[PDB]
């Protein structure tokens, strides 16, 4: 349902910005002074940011937000922040610790969204992926509905403005939303989507239950990418995609954006280079014809470039 303007309805009668930014592993050159890169993000309009416990940037991303509410650029109501509850911290009697641990470290007043980062729950502790000495990980059975009971509580507790899920599919999704006595329903489902795994099936489902598919790896990432094995498919160098983004001029990042935006999906861009965060404010100076949309709503393999 069409997007492309600055803000959008989200369940709770709360409004998300439509195009977002992400934070994680970096560029060798210049390295992990991420504060600077989030500064060439809010100095551009970029108001919705996405982080996690796991790829902690928080302490130093929190701070650049907490510097523009000092320049006199931002005023809080204007800043939307996603963070995530971690797999270890999934055990119900403790959820809120991850949240506080998330909020002290950001120096932000509270968070705007908190989401279920995984059904995959591992035991409580100090190492974020405790493999069982070896093999795979020590995992323990806590419950998905239960962590959601333990999520709503916190909104109702004023600590995080809205709640949502991530990496859930239609089976884990339906469950969240089917449990006894649910109160605050899901907003987003930050699954990975883009032209080569653009879930037409999650879209004609998320939307049925007002769940807003926010997406990572929208522009394919490609640089370095710590999961590359297949000696083949660099999508933002693809045939069709490097055609249409000449038929409407400038190289295929902006079409990678444009399409998803145009489907009515809330994308996440990562960057650090000023340059590629700036070609992306252009994502609204373009347009997309339906023939083309279908010549784009065609590229899909179904290869998940990120894997569990």
UniProtKB/Swiss-Prot annotation:
Domain of life: Eukaryota
Function: Besides being a 3-alpha-hydroxysteroid dehydrogenase, the enzyme can accomplish diverse functions: as quinone reductase, as an aromatic alcohol dehydrogenase, as dihydrodiol dehydrogenase, and as 9-, 11-, and 15-hydroxyprostaglandin dehydrogenase.
Upper classification of the organism: Eukaryota, Metazoa, Chordata, Craniata, Vertebrata
Family matches, as PROSITE patterns: ALDOKETO_REDUCTASE_1 (PS00798), ALDOKETO_REDUCTASE_2 (PS00062), ALDOKETO_REDUCTASE_3 (PS00063)
A GO CC annotation given for this chain: cytosol
Residues bearing the modification Blocked amino end (Met): 1
Catalytic activity: a 3alpha-hydroxysteroid + NADP(+) = a 3-oxosteroid + NADPH + H(+); a 3alpha-hydroxysteroid + NAD(+) = a 3-oxosteroid + NADH + H(+)
Major subcellular location class: cytoplasm
Site positions per UniProt: Lowers pKa of active site Tyr: 84
Regions crossing the membrane: none
The protein's assembly and partners: Monomer.
Entries under InterPro entries matching the protein: AKR, AKR1C, Aldo/ket_reductase_CS, NADP_OxRdtase_dom, NADP_OxRdtase_dom_sf
PANTHER family named in the record: ALDO/KETO REDUCTASE (PTHR11732)
Name of the featured protein: 3-alpha-hydroxysteroid dehydrogenase
One function term, GO molecular function aspect: steroid dehydrogenase activity
Gene3D superfamilies: NADP-dependent oxidoreductase domain
Positions of NADP(+) binding: 20-24, 50, 166-167, 190, 216-221, 270-280
């Amino acid at each position: 349902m069409d997007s492309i303007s600055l803000r959008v309805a989200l369940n709770d009668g709360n409004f998300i910005p439509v195009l977002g930014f992400g934070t994680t592993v970096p560029e060798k050159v210049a390295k992990d002074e991420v504060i600077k890169a989030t500064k060439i993000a809010i100095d551009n309009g970029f108001r919705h940011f996405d982080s996690a416990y796991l790829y902690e940037v928080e302490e130093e991303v929190g701070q650049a937000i907490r510097s523009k509410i000092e320049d006199g650029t931002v005023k809080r109501e204007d800043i939307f922040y996603t963070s995530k509850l971690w797999s270890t911290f999934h055990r119900p009697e403790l959820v809120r610790t991850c949240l506080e641990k998330t909020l002290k470290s950001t120096q932000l007043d509270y968070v705007d969204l908190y989401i279920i980062h995984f059904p995959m729950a591992l035991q409580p502790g100090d190492i974020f992926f405790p493999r069982d000495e070896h093999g795979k990980l020590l995992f323990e059975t806590v419950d998905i509905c239960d962590t959601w009971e333990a999520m709503e509580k916190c909104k109702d507790a004023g600590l995080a403005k809205s709640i949502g899920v991530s990496n859930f599919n239609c089976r884990q999704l339906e469950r969240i939303l089917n449990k006894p006595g649910l109160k605050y329903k899901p907003v987003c489902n930050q699954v990975e989507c883009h032209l080569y795994l653009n879930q037409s099936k999650m879209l004609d489902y998320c939307k049925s239950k007002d769940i807003i598919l926010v997406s990572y790896c929208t522009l394919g990432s490609s640089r370095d990418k710590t999961w590359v094995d297949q000696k083949s498919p660099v999508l933002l160098d693809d045939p069709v995609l490097c055609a249409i983004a000449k038929k409407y001029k400038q190289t295929p990042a902006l079409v990678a954006l444009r399409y998803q935006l145009q489907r009515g999906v809330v994308p996440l861009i990562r960057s650090f280079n000023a340059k590629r965060i700036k070609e992306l404010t252009q994502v609204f100076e373009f347009q997309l014809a339906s023939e083309d949309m279908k010549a784009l709503d065609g590229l899909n393999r179904n290869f998940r470039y990120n894997n569990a």
